[PDB]
Symmetry: C3
Subunit: 602 residues, 3 copies
Amino acid sequence: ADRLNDTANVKDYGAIADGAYHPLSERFATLAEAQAVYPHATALTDSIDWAAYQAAINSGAPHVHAPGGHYVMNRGTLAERDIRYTGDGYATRVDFSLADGPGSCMLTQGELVQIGDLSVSVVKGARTLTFAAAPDLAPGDVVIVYNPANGSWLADRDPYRAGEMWKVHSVSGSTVTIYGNSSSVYLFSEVDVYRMRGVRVSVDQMHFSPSDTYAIAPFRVVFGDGVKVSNYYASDVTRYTGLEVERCFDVSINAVSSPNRSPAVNDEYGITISNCHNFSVYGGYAAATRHAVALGGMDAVCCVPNRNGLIYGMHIEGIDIDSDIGAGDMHGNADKITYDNCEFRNGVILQGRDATVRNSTIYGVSSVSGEALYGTEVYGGTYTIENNRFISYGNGASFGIIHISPGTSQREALLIIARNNTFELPNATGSTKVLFLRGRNSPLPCSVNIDGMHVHMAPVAMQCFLFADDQVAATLNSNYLIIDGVYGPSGTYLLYPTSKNAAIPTRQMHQSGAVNVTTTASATVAAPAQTIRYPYSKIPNVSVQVSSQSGGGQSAIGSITPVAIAYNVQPNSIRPAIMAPSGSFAAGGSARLHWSASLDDI
Amino acid sequence: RLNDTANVKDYGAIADGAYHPLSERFATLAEAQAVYPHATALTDSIDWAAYQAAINSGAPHVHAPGGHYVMNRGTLAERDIRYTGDGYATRVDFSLADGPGSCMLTQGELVQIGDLSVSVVKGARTLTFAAAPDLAPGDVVIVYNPANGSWLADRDPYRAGEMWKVHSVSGSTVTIYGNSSSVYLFSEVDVYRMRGVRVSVDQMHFSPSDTYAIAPFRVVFGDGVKVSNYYASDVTRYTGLEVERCFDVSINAVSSPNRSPAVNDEYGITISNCHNFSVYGGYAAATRHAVALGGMDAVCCVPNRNGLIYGMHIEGIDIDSDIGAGDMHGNADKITYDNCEFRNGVILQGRDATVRNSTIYGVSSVSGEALYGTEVYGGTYTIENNRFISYGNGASFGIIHISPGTSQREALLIIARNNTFELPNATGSTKVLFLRGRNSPLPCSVNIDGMHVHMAPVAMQCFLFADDQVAATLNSNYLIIDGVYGPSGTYLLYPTSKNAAIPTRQMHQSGAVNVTTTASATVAAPAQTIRYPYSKIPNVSVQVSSQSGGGQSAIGSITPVAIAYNVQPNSIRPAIMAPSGSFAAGGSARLHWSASLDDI
Amino acid sequence: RLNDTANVKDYGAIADGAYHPLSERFATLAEAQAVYPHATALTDSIDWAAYQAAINSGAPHVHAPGGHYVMNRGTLAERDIRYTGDGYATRVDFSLADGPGSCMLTQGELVQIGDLSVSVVKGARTLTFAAAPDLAPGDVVIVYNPANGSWLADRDPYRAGEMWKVHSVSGSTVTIYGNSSSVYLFSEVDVYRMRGVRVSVDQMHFSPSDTYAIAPFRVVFGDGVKVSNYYASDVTRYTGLEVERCFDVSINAVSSPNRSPAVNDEYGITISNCHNFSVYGGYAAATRHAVALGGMDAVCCVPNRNGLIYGMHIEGIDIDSDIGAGDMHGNADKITYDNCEFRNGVILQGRDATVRNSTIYGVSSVSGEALYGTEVYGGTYTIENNRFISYGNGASFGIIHISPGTSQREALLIIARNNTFELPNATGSTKVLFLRGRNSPLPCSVNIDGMHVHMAPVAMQCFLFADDQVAATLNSNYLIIDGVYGPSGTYLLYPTSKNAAIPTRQMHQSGAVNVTTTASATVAAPAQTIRYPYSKIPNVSVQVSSQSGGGQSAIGSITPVAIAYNVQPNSIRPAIMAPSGSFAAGGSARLHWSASLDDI
Ligand SMILES: [Ca+2]
Ligand SMILES: [Ca+2]
Ligand SMILES: [Ca+2]
Ligand SMILES: [Ca+2]
Ligand SMILES: [Ca+2]
Ligand SMILES: [Ca+2]
Ligand code: NA
Ligand code: NA
Ligand code: NA
Ligand code: NA
Ligand code: NA
Ligand code: NA
Ligand code: NA
Ligand code: NA
Ligand code: NA
Ligand code: NA
């Protein structure tokens, strides 16, 4: 920068910003005259507000301030360097309604360039990269490995491609020390390697409205490193999205208010994070037709998964539509994304690998089923669902309240961890399934650990706490199904048994009871069948014992030493009994028959 | 205006910490008014006159450079506005102001619209009006029940109602973002449109009126309100900050202490009748409530709802009528504290109240209640992953004490999972979780799973105490008490006539004891203590092995038949019997036992 | 002051990334000093001279517009101050500065006051002085024990003490916000008053001295410190940011990487002897500790206390002496990490240390320890709702490894509830949680509940290993191991002579096996494997049913009597006996069993 100023105020550069379109023709008779002031002008139709804005950026000033006003922009702006954008709050409205075509937005874009190849394959947990020749990298650069094969992350969509970003600590010869560690295997002959020298971009106290005609965010950062978004507003988001960051590293978004209100067609996102690493979204209010927070991807080099994302302390709202979908998104190109301490009105999506939601209030979508947590684009790894309060008005019948359904694209074993959750299901029926695991010709094991599943307001026996099958295959491939720490209506199966899950090892909650009996003149005195509140999927492991009715001292019953046995054991009932060693009891004696049950295959 | 930023000093402020009346500068009121037309009296301060002049320019951004502004009148803005200062050095001091509006007030728009024609059900995602409504996308629509106590009877201004942002309107049908928490009968509610103001404050320090109880910075009918890097001092009467009847409010990095006498309020920051609010990343301190969640008495004084308070350091002081530093008045629905520190105490009231992930101290009362609530609507009270520390005895009030009354409107469920309790002064009267209905009209049920008591020096009364203070019995669907640890002799549930009929699930326990046979038909082991006694006779098992665990069948010539010879809530005698005849004296065995309750 | 915003370029800075000595502008030192009285030599840089001149103006707000400021001296401010820049483009570079104070320093006031007359107890909420104290509301009062190692003996500067904000003073009694974590004997402590500076920094980039180990931006004796949108680069020696002996510190959206050789420290950001601090919303990276929680050696170098680190991405690198990226030195009390990513490793040390809701990787050592601590005071170490991933073997050091020594001051309780452990390189020597006292003087007790091991390829050594490396026995009140899942053959607790006497509670297990009778008095099933072996003989039940579950009583002419024929820690033989005589061969039954331990 041989720049003349450090802060550029857009109005000093000629902006009118009175909410009307003012072409350069209002001020200049010819294009040549206009270009003598604004060399970047291409036509006299170009708006004065745009010409001024781009002039301010072209000054080189690190800080570009747009004072209060309604800037009517019929072209996008471009910055390719570190920049801090500010306004006066909601009063600074930057409106791209009239802009059309690629780049119809406030775009800031860093540098991405392909570098030399690796000579050593990256393993999971690796903390160095080794190159065939000394790499063109310096401390602080971001290095990206990228697998250009379609679907190399997940086959569900071609742009779901594998790869990863790391910040560079140091370089020694041909070995690069990276911060963090590798989530995945990257074979050296399969991946291309890039260097990202990202731009540091900040936005604060500004309000944007997007193009009416072209689906693009009104403020967009590409190849950012150290991106800061605060106190950011959108309005008239009538097509696509209010904000997007793409192929960025180290992104912090807080106190945003960026609602989408577009027709439900293909996207409809409040804010959009695309192919980013080390991002945080907190302290704000997100709203949309479909996804208030959208975690997606685009189709370009280094379109690697969203990874290492923390979305927390957010109010996340959507609306009822025909094809109901959760307001908190996660597209399948996701790894190590965690929602924590959020409200979802309504619904959350867990997809990709290593997906987590904790400490949240989560509503079922307004479908017949009322699924509150849904995912199909499932890579595998661990899906963690902990300390949430779920509320649904649906029936959980065709799709579960939690519904996780991997398909042929699954790449690793899946483990679903669901611990200490509450489920408020006032419209539950005998078909309701609280957690529904449904493989769709899944190729690898899918296993479940439920521990702490408290169902509130259910008016009748439900189908089950857990439903587990494969819709296509003859059996579900799984290592275990654990169902523990449940509460709900009597008659609700722990696991609904089918031929598809009968072979899978299972652990099912311990249950117990006792019943008073009066003896008959019989060798065996069996209680009537005692109901098991939450039926097992198969005959449980049981105990039975005898005491007095009161718990006072008692040994013999009449002249008989009573021998406790399990006379009948069903998945849903038990008949404890006592037998005489020889002969028969006398009629009229008294006892209490105790029983317990569990399954513990793992 | 020429400038979209108005700097208060550029409008004449002195801001040197002294009172400068306009009479210092102008000989007559007319002369003053020729410069400041808003001036009313020559006593009005120059700092105030400048500040209102700045706002009156219409500038979206009003900046008060460093200085001590001595304001003896309040300021008013009724539009979107961004306020800034230079940090703690920008001190806007309303000490000398008295009367209504003795503050920096920013206020939006609220107007009544037409009535609904369809009752709103729980979970509803549209509203239907009798005629096409005067709403546009982005407006906030508020339903309001003007009947006193229509949320909770405890206080007349605890009225029912709800705010939603408008997505779209088709005919008479409005599509709302989010969903309805409640039933709203169309003949019982009024409907309002709120077109709120976007208000920001950053890098400013306020001091309130000395005489009139009003926050020094107040936003009413805000939408998209942003507060950061905000300080208060000399908060000697009421509060340091208030937002009222706002939607979408974000408060971070605040340092707004209260230090007023304990009388009627004493709030660090105050959130009154707001929806979709967040408070994080800050330090809150007060005499009573460092963070206060309250309400006022005006139209659309609906419950605080959908609130997230997280990552906060929340401090109070010891007072005579001890009360938690983290407040929740009864006009609260779906308020969640997460990852906070409370030195000392939190309150859970209203409906669907939550605290998770927090370090929570007992107040400095005899009882040392750490979590308390009485103005209880119902729904689910969730208490998870906390570490509680109390120096009290938990006797009259529990360490967790939840006590709904006649005002309860829905069944209550208390969920207390994976909590730790550090109770170095526990006694034989200590109750860890005390559910006490006060003539409650509806069921109150409990699920405790994971309750680890540390440092208790003696047997406590119980992990759970559950009763109704007035009624003959407690109305409840279940009491579950599982995953506990504490001193031996502590009841899982303390049994009384008031709770005897309630279905209960109680932690599995077990043991074993070696015995030597006597020349008897029955050989009963000594009484084995049940560490955490049950509320009634448990469901039991008994078995027999060798003492070593090596192979053993017959004992002498006798096939031993395991039985439960006696069972108490606090002990058991497992035994073995001979099928006929007697054992010989001197045989050896080990008798095993287990116990649980599982009514639900 | 003539100025409220001072712009450093208006005060003369060039800031073009080159060193410009004052000699470029002034022929003589007399002329330089006439403009810049603070100039000491003509070699002093123009950028530095301008920056110090801007601070010396008294302006509350000092703005450094975009530029690369080449500072060959440090700056000093001793008052409330707001620093701003234009973002990453404002680069304040102290590379060329050397010696003490080679940084942007802002420092408040600390003075010794009068002594206490009453010892402070745990939970105390007032302080009583021998004479009326020199304190006012809002001040911070600090008690300090100057004896070396008075917090932990491990290091001399780990001294006891505490900070509180003053609410009010009545005679000689001070009312404090919050409460006392500790006992402070009045004869052992000195008392100080801290009148801290309110300091803010936003939108700035720093680089440190090349030669002297000091943060480039440093606050000492701050109160209400605010850091946001802060960057560092070329952190080649020590750290990018440090706050020291501050109260109420909020740090968000920082990007401050360290990249120094692994020698003695290597910290991204550093918090030293602070209270009521929060770090959130950012990205921290370093050679050793991305977030460093340490201390210095000076008066009032009290423990870090009441700290919340949340929603952070925390990264380190592989080094020879692997160490966790999320630090906690032993001088820590009530520090909580929540909802963070650790690539790789976290440390829990001091007292009352917590990590929840986090994704935690094992460091790149042979053992792959993910959570480590040895400078252990005691209290409660809470580990909840985490997902651990390690590529190590957990053999010499556990995945979680907590190892108090002789310096331990209070009983230790480790609470590990609902964690998941991904251990693809686990072996028969792997220990998930390893408690290892090193001649510990006080009890160390464990509650594991919910420990789910994923990807382990073989039986591990144990879920819990607990011993003392030095003493003949481990001093402990209890070891609870519940809610586990992992490979078959993995011990719940690995038994040794050192832990054999400790009360234990171990997960309930069960099974069943079909048998066909022989012509025998006793029909025993073969040994049934217990998936997770107990540390000693479990408490068992056994029963008999039909194989189908259909009705069955007698087996031929025999009433079957269930017994525990053999019980080992790792297997069981349920059996049935005839009361007299023998079964006939060829009858059918199903023998059920269960097991648990519940000493506590
Ligand atoms: Ca669209
Ligand atoms: Ca629908
Ligand atoms: Ca008051
Ligand atoms: Ca008190
Ligand atoms: Ca160093
Ligand atoms: Ca290493
Ligand atoms: Na022309
Ligand atoms: Na119910
Ligand atoms: Na008004
Ligand atoms: Na209108
Ligand atoms: Na309208
Ligand atoms: Na009232
Ligand atoms: Na009405
Ligand atoms: Na034998
Ligand atoms: Na040092
Ligand atoms: Na028996």
